[PDB]
Symmetry: D2
Subunit: 215 residues, 4 copies
């Protein structure tokens, strides 16, 4: 039900500070290798007046190399798939709520994504597009209430130097009854490799690997 090379199809509908927009993408990745790539195009709301970086981590933990000794919650959810919800709390009060319903059509994962960000101040690095990239991060996964949770505190590197921190809280919900894993981690590194000047076209990459902490 999971092939070495899979395809990605997605549509994101959302708003930032009351500004609606829409973005669609097509991509591919190798789940057992924890790597993926995609091309994203703004469809509605362009040119986006906020930093594209706040959306990129919303654009699937099936693209994570899981070792044999750690139960793979996500690869166990297919073909039925799973959904996830996330609150991304930025340190200056900007809050982004996102949902993604992931299904499987043959060898293509299909994402239905909603994204709503609020309370981003005018002089902030998000509205002023002063973000550079997300730093590499380490997510922590643990079971709560029969469902899988995902917490990662990370930050964005800033233009004039410095970092802009954000707290992620994700709830992962399998559609069928799968086996739940133990407490573990997933290392991430998301990168926006190419883009045009106003980010209506974006090439985004991500490398992810699961581990059990210090060996």
């Amino acid at each position: 039900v999971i092939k070495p090379d899979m395809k990605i199809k997605l549509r994101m509908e959302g708003a930032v500070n009351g500004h609606p927009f829409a973005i669609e993408g097509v991509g591919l990745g190798k789940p057992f290798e924890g790597k993926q790539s995609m091309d994203l195009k703004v469809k509605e709301g362009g040119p986006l007046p906020f930093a594209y970086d706040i959306l990129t981590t919303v654009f699937n933990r099936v693209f994570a190399k899981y070792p044999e000794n750690i139960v793979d919650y996500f690869k166990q959810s297919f073909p039925e798939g799973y959904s996830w919800e996330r609150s991304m709390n930025y340190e200056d009060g900007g809050i982004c709520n996102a949902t993604n319903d992931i299904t499987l059509d043959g060898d293509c994962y299909i994402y239905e994504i909603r994204f709503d960000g609020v309370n981003f101040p005018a002089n902030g690095p998000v509205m002023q597009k002063r973000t550079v990239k997300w730093e590499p991060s380490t997510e922590k996964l643990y079971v709560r209430d029969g469902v899988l949770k995902g917490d990662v505190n990370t930050a964005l590197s800033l233009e004039g130097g410095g970092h802009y921190r954000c707290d992620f809280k994700t709830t992962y919900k399998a559609k069928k009854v799968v086996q739940l894993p133990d407490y573990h981690f997933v290392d991430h590194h998301i990168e926006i490799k190419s883009h045009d000047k106003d980010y209506s076209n974006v090439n985004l990459h991500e490398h992810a690997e699961a581990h059990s902490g210090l060996p």
Copy 2:
């Protein structure tokens, strides 16, 4: 452009835990008395699977009795109107992001409302509908970066006794340039006066008054 009896029309589109819904309402109130009333109808997504209480405070601080000695930011923004954004952080991690774009058509306020709540646990009081009502509250309003902010920390009473806390962070943005007020407060009391079995119809009231704290 602001008389003692005004009307309200609204449409809310939103989702909770990835579950979409839509609600419309019609109402009226007395802005100079800080009182208002409305009838709400679910149009999509019914029956709502979450506590209706999380929606009511998203369903306009022009309906607040402001004394002369406190600058009225909201009555000053009309007829052009204003918009507001809000994050509502519940103590169990449930987060609701909401926006409201308020315009004026004659003597009727028109709301375009978006509402997005995520990470509400299945066993929580919201998904289990164990909330009774919002307690009376006191909002604190202050200026930051030329716009008016609104912080209020309050709670919902629970079915078996106890309180379920939530933190509100609201940004108020007037569409035209108006005068900024000083640090002040607004006392609130929101109430569901009537509803049917599945909350498809809701009659909602709110009482609001501004003050400057202990004299």
Copy 3:
């Protein structure tokens, strides 16, 4: 067991950012009117390198005018007394933890206070002493798991204008079993009415009254 005119004596021992200090005070107030005043003298750690305002709300909710229809948890805990614990979470990450053990010797309340604040940035308004005063505030008191809690969200006005927000979470523990009140509020207004150049001497006042919200 409480008279209209009571006296206060206290000693606070603590540190901020790892630098120790100690302060003693003597004061007086009228519990049934919720007003009080005191004189504080620094005995250790002077001259204080941090804003004195971060300390003032630590320097007894018995000094609060309680209406007949609201159970007075604090005046009912005497002569045995009560203790309280409080975290004060400032929006830039500075955190102050405080405790107060309140006893009664005849007509004088005795406070044994501990105060520990950390992570105050050098460029922040606290370490740079850019604070002016606490704004009037409204605290909410509610029972949780048999204990009386007190949450209040307020801010400090800054020198060049602006506000520096802080989250208070207080736990009130009576020494004997006392009747618990219902959900209610307490309005506050604390003021430094006089001080010398380096705040070695401070005359501090507070006016507090409990109420039930709108109306």
Copy 4:
């Protein structure tokens, strides 16, 4: 000023929910291997009524294996030493503030530690001693306003399954001016390897290694 084998001596003074205690310890470790061990004795306030686990991470990032390509701030600050402050906010509202002043006498590190935790609920896992161990963690170190910061959010495994989350925010200040590192990580794994019934004697270990995350 750094040898393969160093010794540790410390004294911690503190209070939890207002009840004072004091602990001293002696230990040894290998800074270049990022592992250390120590034996701790409760001297005042015993037997401790709270989970000992809340204290262990307060009982020195010099015991962290730093690779050549990452600046070692802690090792590059001796012999003068450094200090650190930290806020540990647990998900149920219990918050612990701690400071450690680290000096070097020959080949022995000396810690002067203050520890203050408040608002731990009686029915919570800390006051009921339902904690098992800290999970392995990944800390993130970054520069802000010329100072070294360390953020890690982790959790304690609880008796019978489950996790109790905590957010650490640490400020590292070398006494002398050293060299600030770039954004990097330090993996942690702390374990109580032996203790007597009421934790009057505790032998504590920690293994730590710095890295740069997924490349």
